[PDB]
Design a protein around this ligand. Sequence first.
Ligand SMILES: O=c1cc[nH]c(=O)[nH]1
Ligand SMILES: O=c1cc[nH]c(=O)[nH]1
Ligand SMILES: [Cl-]
Ligand SMILES: [Cl-]
Length: 163
Amino acid sequence: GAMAPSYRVKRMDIAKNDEECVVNAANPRGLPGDGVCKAVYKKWPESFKNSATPVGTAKTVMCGTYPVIHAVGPNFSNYTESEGDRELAAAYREVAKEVTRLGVNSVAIPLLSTGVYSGGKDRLTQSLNHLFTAMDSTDADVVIYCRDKEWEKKISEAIQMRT
Ligand SMILES: O=c1cc[nH]c(=O)[nH]1
Ligand SMILES: O=c1cc[nH]c(=O)[nH]1
Ligand SMILES: [Cl-]
Ligand SMILES: [Cl-]
């Protein structure tokens, strides 16, 4: 565990993280994909051996000794708001189980279903609150990675609100 488990946010490519493991915003088929998934494929392509896994689940594959946790959020283009919400919460609960099982002291995590799987909606608050529900009972240092300056400010504010 971390000495004083924390949440932080950074605005940069998750493929350059400084944590003991990474969460991929995966697709169910283990394909290179786009966005975070493509950056993860470039950096850790070995981790895509038998990484296919259903929506709402996480599957870890080692790249050397570095764990890549493939977390499959719902594509809100395909799911109803209600079913999508249930699967998005479930994907994060499976991430918390994997982070715990691995015994890591830190994890780099993107906001699932906020990019090409958002169904064109802003899901910062929805995705971040499911991340907190899952990760609050873990003792790993969590570092959330984002792209956009306005998202960094909103994520930082949500973290600081609780402290
Ligand atoms: O390929 C995919 C699927 C989900 N999320 C991404 O970032 N890329
Ligand atoms: O538009 C987006 C989606 C995810 N993360 C960001 O920082 N911006
Ligand atoms: Cl960067
Ligand atoms: Cl996404």
